């Protein structure tokens, strides 16, 4: 009887009134759907009524504006307005060509508000506690596509338009918008057959002319949709050929990912392969740096596009292209050295030809002379400029030689000349070298930079042969001393000359320069060096362990590699793009890194690494955490609780140590390592609590005078007591200590010398803590504004928490504004934050619509705890800045209109809050001003007696 | 409205392209219900011209909207009836720039629709009057006679009575012929029946006189020999002195008496509104006496309408215009006493306020208003001069009357000079023409095409010849506003000193209503605000001026005037 009912309703709406019919039908179908989800006969009828409503809005366009009802419902209480049928109806009407933008920006603001709300709830469980009602628009909008598998056409058009403008409006809530758009586009592509070509055309037209904003979303969702359905491009008659022009816009990573995505369709389709080979052939000899970079990037992929390792003309014809390209500049000579190994893992005789080409290349600078004066033909790499990166070429040579050796005429020659070079470097010291002067380097000089590029190039030369001798020799003492001599040449020429005269004027934040080692090699080195003691050891590591300088470099290279995995998503050396491969490498190196730390600076290096493994583990390998956690030997928390416990033991021993043994660099990393590992402890575990009570009890007892140590530890406590309870209890206690620790605003009454925390001493109550407390206080006020926004049967519960929290929050500022703060930015933060908490106005402004006793008590508290104390602060800041202004050159206009600007703003905030009390006092028929006092102002009188 | 304008441009440039989507537009009009009267009278006016000029789907859309009207001739929604009727009249307006069969169908349609209901009949007649008045330039005579032949049977078959009283002796009040014709015994029977027309409803009586005027203006270039002798009609009403019976408060006849006199007064308003403009022998004085008669009728209307605490007449005393049969601008064309001129300027003031700054006040362009006022301001200026001399000579009844006439007239000049359109130079040519007319009136000859600032000087000497004779502060303030409106936007030093002195003495001029009771109030406050703002803007040393006002102007008021004023400025008071 529902189709006849909807028929009579739209008949009535066509001519008669149209106000409440839509609300009734949407509510009825809401309850119908909530029943149904707990099938086909319902989907068909729902599609029919959707079509009837879209026809009604098409013919009778006046039924859509009455968007106003949904907007009012959302404003009255956020969330409970985007019902699945309501959103489906507006989505269908979004393609009406009329009123699209109003509906569309309503959806945009609703979805961004919902994602921000989800972010806050994931950042605050207390809001989840008092506001369990959550409305996640992502799920309901990704459920429509699940329901759109029943012949919905205009619904699908609305979906694809919504996604297109989603990528348009992207450019973190913007990243969440990208995620939602990719999800909805993938769903509507996967299940809708006749529109998938339209989706492909839209995404192909949207990627172009888009490079300023991060556009990796286009390539990633394109890869996902083509790996789900590769035949769409051929169904679209392979419209990817026009995209080959992207070699000039931004082919730094977009081309690589695009080719990665389209790999199977290039393989199956000969026409697109021919187009790619011709476009790259015309691109390679373009003499542009960008064009050549795009060409070599495409070459890195096309060789492995075709597989024969387990059509031979295709194999042999591609050999000479990179050989010809090798003659170009060093910058374009760079990436081929790295990418050769990837394709060399995919060939047998092509590998032999590639080795022969590389051997002919290295003969250019070999100088075959049988162990005499060093083979430095670096003079050719001068055209102040550099022509060939010898270090990268040598690294590629070593890696490819290792691959060839492991796989199963010139190869014997290849090994001996490499061995000859190793025997030549050990015999060629900094006496036969041309760069024997300690200060021949000169920045911004035609010869100094020539020495600098020679200096950096030889460092990579030494590093590569370190890998060779370690790998070619197997527990053979003769090769180990060669490694010692190589680093002896390396350190003697890297520790001094460079970073003395080369570049060390600014303090080096980083360490030993960019290394050309293998993540596999460094893993083998550390695992063989530490946590390895067997009869196969030929006493070579015993003399190797004496080289503590080699020890520092041996781990600093690893810190460089995982930092590449920190800042970027990849690294150097072989197996830099196979995420499982380093995951195993990271799984292996972490233990020996931990073992070295637990064996007992040098350990400072490995511990810094562990901080960056855990950081990289969560930020990159989020889905792969359980195996890594279990690899340290299923619930992550029990193993995580074990891991922090050993770190807890290190801290408690280290913190309890004397001040002479504080090694602050260790403390910062270990504090941060907990703040990173404590992130993934699950909410429903007890170990959450005893750890949380441990850091509280360690805060109550320990009295640390370091500043960054206190700042880092407090961040951990406030990054964990933000998802379990209300932090205002902690903030109040911190404010209790700060006021007790420091003096008083009136310097007349003595605060009792309490100590809630031992960390806060006569020194740490400086901006060190007082800026963190006000930082947390600002955060609490920020979400309260959202709660006040939500407040404007569930309403009563919302008002309970807000009044309770603001009551506690007022006790925080009341005890904090009475603090005798020092000069500087800490005073400025308090004055501005006081302007924030008063903007108390919005809650008063909302309740004008209504009175409750609890709200009256808050104003009673606010009047008796904030305003009279707040004005006392202004009478004090005037003299502390007068004292601070005497220390000028011992113009000034900057320092007089910058330390006093907050004062007028604070006055305005007080009166604006005071003014809205007038409105409530008259309207609410209750006088709530007997609690507070009269407003106080100030004047002056220029002391002309002391004018001069 | 912007979209209707661009659609009008599209249809005038080429209708054919619109006809491609004109079917969708027509179906849209058939679909939604958000119609408004003006957008109907434009949309239907545009929509019908395409059918009989171009042929793409003209028959389809034409018959579609025709059938829409027929189906909704008496709609369930009541307002659709009147919007359909205005649509119909604008159809025959476009047609009367063949349609004979369709015209017959629609006229029979509306005739069946207007069977006995008078409200739709009154609206139909009013909209037809609007049609003919707007398209007076050229309407088809024979087609109009085919359609509008009811004129000979509407008025002179239902509201024509013998001059002698011989009908309905026993009635509510005896029928008395007031305001008799000047030349008695010229027609066999000339008297309009409204008192026996208690109810044909008397609502449909005022607009149809305008209709007869337009019919006689279209049948002949003049408007004589068909109604010329039928203007001097002794108007058949109750006894004149029945206002003494208002104390009875019948509420059964006196309530009907109010509508009776209201309809008769609207009749008279049309009488002056109709044939004043025409110039002919032995009829100007009749128009003047009719204007005196409407003055008296308003006077008698005032008391009876004040007696009843609420009453609703149909649109078909001072703020009563919407229920009043509106007067046109052709009345002042024949300006060639105090109360009558006060009334004329009273109903002129609102028009000049709206045009220069249903709702029949909104159908003339400001440029046309300017050319009309400059066309016929000479008798205006002559009467201004004579009554200015009267004011220069020195009972309340004429003094206050002429003071109000003076104030309304100077308000007329202010909004004739404060018209914001003067900012652009396009209209400044007609402005210069008006200034030459004014200067020629002031200085005979030797004043053609004098330069702009000297024209300002001429207007300064002329319009300030009336400076010494100002009865009300309103007149003085509005004169200052007149000059501010005519003075240069970049204000010049000689005018700076002139206006400084003039407003100084105006603030120093006493203001006394004839019966005491100094001219205070709320309009007085706003006028004082604007005048003193203009003064302080044009005074040379503004700081010295405000210092004087705050040093000697106020303290005398603060120490002396309990209810009086400051000695230096009688315009300053405790209230002001």
Curated annotation (Swiss-Prot), chain A:
The UniProt record lists the keyword RNA-binding: no
Domain of life: Eukaryota
Protein modification: Monoubiquitinated by FANCL during S phase and upon genotoxic stress. Deubiquitinated by USP1 as cells enter G2/M, or once DNA repair is completed. Monoubiquitination requires the FANCA-FANCB-FANCC-FANCE-FANCF-FANCG-FANCM complex. Ubiquitination is required for binding to chromatin, DNA repair, and normal cell cycle progression. Monoubiquitination is stimulated by DNA-binding. Phosphorylated in response to DNA damage by ATM and/or ATR. Phosphorylation of FANCI promotes ubiquitination of FANCD2, which prevents DNA release from the FANCI-FANCD2 complex.
Stretches assigned to coiled coil: none
GO CC term, one of those recorded: nucleoplasm
Phosphoprotein listed as a keyword: yes
Keywords: Isopeptide bond, Phosphoprotein, Ubl conjugation
Cross-linked residues, Glycyl lysine isopeptide (Lys-Gly) (interchain with G-Cter in ubiquitin): 282
GO biological process: DNA repair
Family: Belongs to the Fanconi anemia group I protein family.
Subunit structure: Homodimer. Part of a FANCI-FANCD2 heterodimeric complex that binds and scans dsDNA for DNA damage. Interacts with FANCL. Interacts with MTMR15/FAN1. Interacts with POLN. Interacts with UBL5; the interaction promotes FANCI homodimerization.
Role this protein plays: Plays an essential role in the repair of DNA double-strand breaks by homologous recombination and in the repair of interstrand DNA cross-links (ICLs) by promoting FANCD2 monoubiquitination by FANCL and participating in recruitment to DNA repair sites. The FANCI-FANCD2 complex binds and scans double-stranded DNA (dsDNA) for DNA damage; this complex stalls at DNA junctions between double-stranded DNA and single-stranded DNA. Participates in S phase and G2 phase checkpoint activation upon DNA damage.
This protein's name: Fanconi anemia group I protein
Shown chain mapped onto the complete sequence: 209 to 1298 of 1338
Swiss-Prot record, chain B:
PTM info: Monoubiquitinated on Lys-71 during S phase and upon genotoxic stress. Deubiquitinated by USP1 as cells enter G2/M, or once DNA repair is completed. Monoubiquitination prevents DNA release from the FANCI-FANCD2 complex. FANCD2 is only ubiquitinated in the FANCI-FANCD2 complex and the monoubiquitination of FANCD2 is promoted by phosphorylation of FANCI.
Covalent link Glycyl lysine isopeptide (Lys-Gly) (interchain with G-Cter in ubiquitin), residues: 71
Domain of life from the UniProt record: Eukaryota
Signal peptide span: none
Localization per Swiss-Prot or TrEMBL: Nucleus
Similarity-based family: Belongs to the Fanconi anemia protein FANCD2 family.
Subunit field text: Homodimer; cannot be ubiquitinated and does not bind DNA. Part of a FANCI-FANCD2 heterodimeric complex that binds and scans dsDNA for DNA damage. Interacts directly with FANCE and FANCI. Interacts with USP1 and MEN1. The ubiquitinated form specifically interacts with BRCA1 and BLM. Both the nonubiquitinated and the monoubiquitinated forms interact with BRCA2; this interaction is mediated by phosphorylated FANCG and the complex also includes XCCR3. The ubiquitinated form specifically interacts with MTMR15/FAN1 (via UBZ-type zinc finger), leading to recruit MTMR15/FAN1 to sites of DNA damage.
Role description: Required for maintenance of chromosomal stability. Promotes accurate and efficient pairing of homologs during meiosis. Involved in the repair of DNA double-strand breaks, both by homologous recombination and single-strand annealing. The FANCI-FANCD2 complex binds and scans double-stranded DNA (dsDNA) for DNA damage; this complex stalls at DNA junctions between double-stranded DNA and single-stranded DNA. May participate in S phase and G2 phase checkpoint activation upon DNA damage.
Listed name of the protein: Fanconi anemia group D2 protein
């Amino acid at each position: 009887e529902i189709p006849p009912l909807v028929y009579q309703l739209l008949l009535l709406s066509a001519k008669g009134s149209k106000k409440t019919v839509l609300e009734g039908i949407i509510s009825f179908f809401n309850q119908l759907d909530k029943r149904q989800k707990e099938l086909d006969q319902l989907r068909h009828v729902e599609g029919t009524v959707i079509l009837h409503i879209v026809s009604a809005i098409n013919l009778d366009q006046d039924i859509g504006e009455e968007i106003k009802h949904l907007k009012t419902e959302q404003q009255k209480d956020p969330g409970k307005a985007l019902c699945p049928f309501s959103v489906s109806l507006l989505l269908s009407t979004a393609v009406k060509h009329r009123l699209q933008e109003q509906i569309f920006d309503f959806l945009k603001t609703s979805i961004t508000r919902s994602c921000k709300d989800l972010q806050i709830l994931q950042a605050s469980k207390f809001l989840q506690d008092l506001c369990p009602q959550q409305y996640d628009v992502t799920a309901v909008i990704l459920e429509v596509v699940k329901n759109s598998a029943f012949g919905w056409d205009h619904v699908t058009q609305g979906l694809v338009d919504l996604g297109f403008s989603l990528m348009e409006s992207y450019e973190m809530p913007a990243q969440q918008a990208c995620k939602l758009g990719a999800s909805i586009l993938l769903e509507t592509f996967k299940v809708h057959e006749p529109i998938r070509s339209d989706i492909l055309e839209q995404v192909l037209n949207r990627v172009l002319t888009k490079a300023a904003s991060p556009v990796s979303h286009f390539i990633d969702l394109l890869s996902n949709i083509v790996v789900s359905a590769p035949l769409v491009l051929q169904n679209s008659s392979s419209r990817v050929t026009e995209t080959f022009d992207n070699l000039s816009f931004l082919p730094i990573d977009t081309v690589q990912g695009l080719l990665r995505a389209v790999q199977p369709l290039l393989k199956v389709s000969m026409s697109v392969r021919d187009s790619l080979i011709l476009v790259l052939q015309k691109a390679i000899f373009s003499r542009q740096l960008d064009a050549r970079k795009a060409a070599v990037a495409g070459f890195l992929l096309l060789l492995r596009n075709f597989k024969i390792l387990g059509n031979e003309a295709f194999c042999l014809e591609i050999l000479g292209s990179l050989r010809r390209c090798l003659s170009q500049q060093a910058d374009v000579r760079l990436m081929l050295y790295e990418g050769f190994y990837d394709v060399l893992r995919r060939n047998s005789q092509l590998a032999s030809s590639i080795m022969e080409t590389l051997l002919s290349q290295i003969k250019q600078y070999y100088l075959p002379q049988q162990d005499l004066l060093p083979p430095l033909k670096l003079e050719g790499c001068i055209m102040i400029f550099l022509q060939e990166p010898l270090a990268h070429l040598l690294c590629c040579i070593q890696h490819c030689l290792a691959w060839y050796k492991s796989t199963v005429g010139f190869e014997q020659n290849f090994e001996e000349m490499l061995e000859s070079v190793t025997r030549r470097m050990i015999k060629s010291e900094l006496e036969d070298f041309e760069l024997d002067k300690s200060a021949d380097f000169s920045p911004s000089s035609g010869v100094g930079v020539k020495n600098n590029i020679y200096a950096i190039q030889v460092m990579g030369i030494c590093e590569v042969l370190i890998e060779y001798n370690f790998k070619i020799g197997n527990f053979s003492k003769n090769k180990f001393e060669d490694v010692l001599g190589l680093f002896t040449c390396y350190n003697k020429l890297s520790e001094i000359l460079k970073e003395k005269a080369g570049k060390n004027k600014s303090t080096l934040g980083n360490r030993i320069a960019r290394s050309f080692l293998s993540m596999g090699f460094v893993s083998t080195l550390l695992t063989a060096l530490f946590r390895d003691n067997a009869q196969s050891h030929e006493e070579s590591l015993a003399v190797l362990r004496s080289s503590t300088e080699f020890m520092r470099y041996a781990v600093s290279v690893a810190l460089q590699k995982v930092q590449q995995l920190e800042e970027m998503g990849q690294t150097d050396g072989p197996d830099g793009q196979n995420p499982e491969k380093m995951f195993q490498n990271l799984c292996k190196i972490t233990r020996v890194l931990l073992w070295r730390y637990t064996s007992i600076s040098i350990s400072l290096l490995c511990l810094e690494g562990l901080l960056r493994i855990f950081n990289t583990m969560q930020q990159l390998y989020a889905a792969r955490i359980p195996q890594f956690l279990q690899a340290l030997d299923i619930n992550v928390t029990e193993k995580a609780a074990f891991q922090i416990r050993q770190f807890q033991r290190s801290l408690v021993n280290q913190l309890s140590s004397a001040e002479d043994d504080f090694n602050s660099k260790e403390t910062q990393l270990l504090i941060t390592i907990l703040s990173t590992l404590s992130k993934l402890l699950d909410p429903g575990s007890q170990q959450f609590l005893q750890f949380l009570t441990w850091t509280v009890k360690i805060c109550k007892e320990n009295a640390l005078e370091d500043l960054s140590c206190c700042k880092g530890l407090l961040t951990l406590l406030f990054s964990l007591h933000v998802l379990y309870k209300s932090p205002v209890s902690l903030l109040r206690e911190l404010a209790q200590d700060i006021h007790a620790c420091l003096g008083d605003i009136d310097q007349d009454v003595e605060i009792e010398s309490r100590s809630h925390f031992a960390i806060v001493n006569v020194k740490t109550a400086a901006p060190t803590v007082c800026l963190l407390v006000l930082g947390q206080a600002d955060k609490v006020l920020e979400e309260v504004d959202w709660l006040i926004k939500r407040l404007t049967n569930q309403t009563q519960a919302l008002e309970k928490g807000v009044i309770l929290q603001l009551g506690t929050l007022l006790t925080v500022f009341h005890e904090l504004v009475q603090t005798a703060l020092p000069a500087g930015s800490c005073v400025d933060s308090l004055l501005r934050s006081l302007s924030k908490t008063y903007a108390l106005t919005s809650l008063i402004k909302h309740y004008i619509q209504a009175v409750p006793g609890r709200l009256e008590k808050l104003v009673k508290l606010s009047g008796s705890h904030l305003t009279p104390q707040c004005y006392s602060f202004i009478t004090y800041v005037q003299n502390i800045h007068s004292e601070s202004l005497s220390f000028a050159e011992e113009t000034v206009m900057a320092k007089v209109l910058r330390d006093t600007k907050p004062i007028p703003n604070l006055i305005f905030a007080i009166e604006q809050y005071e003014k809205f009390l007038i409105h409530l006092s008259k309207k609410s028929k209750v006088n709530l001003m007997q609690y507070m006092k009269l407003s106080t102002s100030r004047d002056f009188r220029i002391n002309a007696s002391m004018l001069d | 409205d912007i979209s209707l304008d661009v659609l009008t441009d599209l249809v005038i440039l080429h209708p054919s392209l619109l006809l491609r989507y004109a079917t969708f537009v027509k179906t849209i009009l058939d679909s939604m219900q958000k119609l408004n009267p003006c957008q109907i009278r434009k949309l239907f006016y545009i929509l019908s011209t395409l059918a009989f000029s171009q042929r793409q789907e003209g028959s389809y859309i034409q018959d579609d909207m025709h059938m829409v009207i027929r189906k909704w001739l008496s709609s369930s929604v009541p307002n659709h009836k009147q919007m359909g009727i205005i649509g119909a009249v604008t159809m025959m307006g476009s047609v009367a720039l063949e349609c004979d069969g369709q015209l017959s169908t629609l006229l029979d349609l509306v005739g069946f629709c207007c069977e006995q209901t008078p409200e739709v009949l009154a609206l139909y007649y009013d909209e037809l009057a609007n049609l003919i008045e707007k398209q007076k330039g050229n309407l088809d005579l024979q087609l109009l006679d085919k359609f509008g032949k009811s004129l000979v049977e509407d008025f002179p078959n239902d509201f024509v009575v013998d001059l002698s009283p011989t009908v309905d002796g026993s009635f509510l009040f005896p029928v008395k012929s007031l305001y008799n014709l000047d030349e008695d015994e010229t027609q066999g029977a000339i008297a309009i029946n409204l008192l026996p027309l208690v109810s044909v409803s008397p609502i449909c009586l005022s607009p149809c006189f305008r209709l007869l005027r337009l019919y006689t203006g279209e049948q002949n270039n003049g408007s004589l020999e068909e109604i010329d002798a039928l203007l001097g009609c002794p108007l058949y009403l109750t006894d004149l002195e029945v206002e003494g019976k208002l104390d009875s408060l019948s509420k059964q006849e006196r309530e009907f008496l109010c509508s009776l006199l209201f309809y008769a007064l609207n009749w008279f308003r049309e009488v002056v509104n109709a044939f004043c403009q025409q110039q002919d022998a032995e009829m100007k004085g009749k128009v003047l006496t009719r204007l005196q008669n409407i003055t008296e009728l308003q006077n008698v209307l005032g008391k009876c309408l004040a007696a009843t605490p609420g009453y609703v007449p149909p649109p078909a005393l001072q703020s009563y215009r919407p229920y009043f049969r509106e007067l046109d601008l052709e009345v002042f064309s024949v300006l060639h006493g105090p109360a009558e001129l006060c009334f004329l300027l009273d109903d002129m003031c609102w028009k000049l306020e709206h045009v220069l700054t249903f709702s029949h006040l909104c159908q003339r362009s400001p440029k046309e208003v300017a050319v009309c006022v400059v066309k016929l301001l000479k008798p205006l200026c002559n009467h201004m001069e004579n009554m200015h001399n009267y004011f220069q000579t020195v009972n309340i009844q004429e003094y206050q009357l002429m003071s109000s006439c003076y104030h309304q007239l100077l308000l007329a000049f202010r909004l004739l000079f404060a018209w914001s359109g003067f900012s652009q130079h396009e209209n400044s040519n007609l402005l210069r023409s008006a200034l030459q007319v004014l200067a020629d009136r002031l200085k005979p000859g030797e004043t053609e095409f004098l330069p702009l600032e000297e024209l300002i000087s001429e207007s300064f000497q002329y319009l300030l010849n009336f400076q010494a004779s100002i009865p009300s502060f309103q007149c003085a303030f509005i004169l200052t506003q007149v000059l501010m409106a005519i003075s240069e936007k970049p204000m010049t030093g000689w005018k700076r000193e002139k206006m400084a002195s003039l407003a100084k003495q105006f603030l120093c001029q006493s203001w006394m209503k004839p019966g005491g009771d100094r001219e205070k109030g709320s309009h007085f406050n706003s006028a004082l605000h604007t005048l003193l703002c203009v003064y302080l803007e044009h005074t040379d040393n503004i700081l010295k001026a405000i210092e004087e006002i705050s040093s000697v102007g106020v303290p005398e008021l603060i120490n002396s005037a309990k209810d009086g004023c400051s000695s230096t400025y009688p315009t300053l008071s405790r209230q002001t």
